[PDB]
Structure formats: C-alpha cells, structure tokens
Amino acid sequence: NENLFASFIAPTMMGLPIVTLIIMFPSLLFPTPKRLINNRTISIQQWLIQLTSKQMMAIHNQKGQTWSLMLMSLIMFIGSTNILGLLPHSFTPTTQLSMNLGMAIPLWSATVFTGFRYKTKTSLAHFLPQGTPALLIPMLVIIETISLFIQPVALAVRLTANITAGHLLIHLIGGATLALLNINTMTAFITFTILILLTILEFAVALIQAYVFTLLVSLYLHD
Template sequence: MNENLFASFTTPTLMGFPIVILIIMFPNILFPSPRRLINNRLISFQHWLIQLILNQLMAMHSTKGRTWSLMLISLIMFIGSTNLLGLLPHSFTPTTQLSMNLAMAIPLWAGTVILGFRHKTKTSLAHFLPQGTPTPLIPVLVIIETISLFIQPLALAVRLTANITAGHLLMHLIGAATLALSSINALTALITFIILTLLTILEFAVAMIQAYVFTLLVSLYLHDNT
C-alpha cells in the first residue's frame, strides 16, 4: 500500500468535526497563569524567557509601538508552542497550513500599515517614492513599492509554512526509511536513526527560530510605521 506523505498535514477529525480548535487551545496549559500561586523552576524560567524576548523586541520601539508588546509576546508564544507540539507523535501542526498563517499575517500587517498611514502619513507615502528618483522612473517605482508592500504578509505566511512543512516532511521521509531499513541492514538503519535524531533536535530549534523570525518581522513592520 502506498503511503500518503502529506497525511500528517491534514486536519484530524473527531466524529466528522475538525479538532484543530482543541489542538490550538491546548498550549494554554503550558504557560503560567495567575491561578498558579506557587512558582516552580519551569514557571520561573518561562517568566525570565518571556521578559528577555520582550525586552529585545521592544528595545527599538517608541512609546506608541510598545503598546503592541502584549500582542507580540502572545504571538511568539502561540507560534512557538504550536510548532513544538506539532513535533509530538500523532499530532498536528496548525502552522503547516498556509490559510492559518495568512490569517495571522494579514491582520497584523494591515494593523501596522493602517497605524503608519494614520500617524505618519507623509513618511508612509514617501516610502513609495525615494528622494531623487528620475521623473521617467516614478510610475515604475511606485508600482514596485506598492507590490513589495502588499507582498509582505504573503512572504510572512509562506516563510513559516515552508520551513515547518519542509522539516516535518524530511523527518517523515527519514523515519520511513529507518523503519524500512531496520529489517534489511541494521547498521544502515542505525545511521539513519542517528540522522533522524539530529534532525529532530534541529527541528526543535527551527520551531522556536521561526516563531521568533515571524514576530520579529511583524515588529520591524510596526517600527517602520510608528
């Protein structure tokens, strides 16, 4: 029987209903809440890490930009946790779906652009036409800058989708090869298993890095518009 390589990227269902909402809500139990009155080392480490990331993201922002701090830290925690939970066996990674990533990228990008046109109208319009542009090139540059502006949310979503999907697919292929080689050549199977282990460790790093990159780019868009 031929195996569908992309079966792990389909949304699981329960009695015909998609359970992606439950999967997305599941990471909430991993983070500290006011109901937990007694801190342990895990919660203290989470607080320290959140504060460190927040300081790095907000260091370049003005007072107006720092009002987005809760939004940005929630975004990186959500993407990072869903990426990590997607590495568990028999689990589903919502960030492998382009539709979901676009649903995150477009409103955030639109919010930064609207904020820029509202508070820095002249500066935002000036981005479409660099100073000193020759007159014959003005229409072409305006079109190019407009396209580059509207392609930003698509680039955000595609980057996250492609990196997470490629890593999961590679793990799936190497895992299937290891299982097939286990009954043929034990030494080769051991080598592929070691490669699979190293790739899994790399995917844990990629899961966190992609969450940081996505949030950092949104933060840069916000910085350009505040």
C-alpha cells in the same frame, strides 16, 4: 553493489481532525500565579519573557510601545504550537495554510492603517526615498509598491512551507528505517541522521523570531 537503499510508497497525510481542542491545549501548559514568590516552574517561564520583551522594546522607543505587549503573545503561541508537534503522533495547527492567512492579514493591515490615522500623508510618502533623480521615477514606484503587497503573502507562506517541510523528512528518513530489512549496518546511520535532524527541527523556535521581528520592522518602518 553493496548497500542497496529501499523505499516505501505510502501517502503522507495531513488530515484534519478536531482542531478547536488542539488549539486551546498549549494555553494550559503555561500557568499564571497570584503570588510574590513562585514555584520554580513558572519562574523559568517568567524569566524567559523578560529577556525577549527587552528586544522588541528597544528598537521602537515611541508611543508605539503600547502595541508591543501583544507581540510577546504572538511569539508564545507559534513558539509552542511548533514545538509540541515534534512528539510521536501529535498535530500542529500551523501546518495548515488556513490560519496563517488569518495571522498575516489582520496584523499586516493593522500596520498600514496605523499611520494613516495619524500621519495621513507621509506614511506612504515613504515611497519617496531620496533627493529624486529624473530617469527613474516610474521604474521606482511600480517596484516599491509591488514589494509592499507581497508582504502579507511573504509573511504567511514562509511559515507554512518550511514547518511542514520538517515533517516530511521526519517521516521519509524515518520510514526508510522500517523498510530496511536488507543489510543491518546502514540502519543505524539513518537512525543517527534522524537524531541529528530532530535537533535541527528545534529551529521551530528560531522561525518565530523571524515572524515577530519582521512584523516589528514592518511596524517600525511604517511607524
């Protein structure tokens, strides 16, 4: 009975203040120069695109490369609006589940209607995998279609659910420091747990690779 942890009971509030300012604000962090040589703070933004435009280009190698100049705009928005919110009292728009159901469905259904305007038969004859055996046709095409319509829900809900899960352990491990007016040795160890956990919460960049990329595979496979 040496080190008694404490807790504080307080509501954890994802309120909704004025959003249409907060959305526009990580656009003005990135400038664009009309010059040949630039000014050594855009120049490391301009290099960072060159890299990851050469990995969502290499797989496709089609005349579906026209689509890929948009997919690098999709990575900078939720790459920024997940990285701004680590600050003391900032607010992330990708916390709320509303816009992510408007980021999945106008993009996911832009893929199944891409081959249906050109191929019209073999896009969803990709439901036929192989040299058809007999005992498992109905066990297959009720499975590979129930794992198609999961994909818009599978794409949006994986983003909202772990981003907000980062924010609660920021509060709760952090709030247990404030309410630790018992023995002062254990206060540092909870603080040292925080400054490790904030390094893990720069996997909010790592979770945007797993949103543009499984949009490519959900584009490359259909087209």
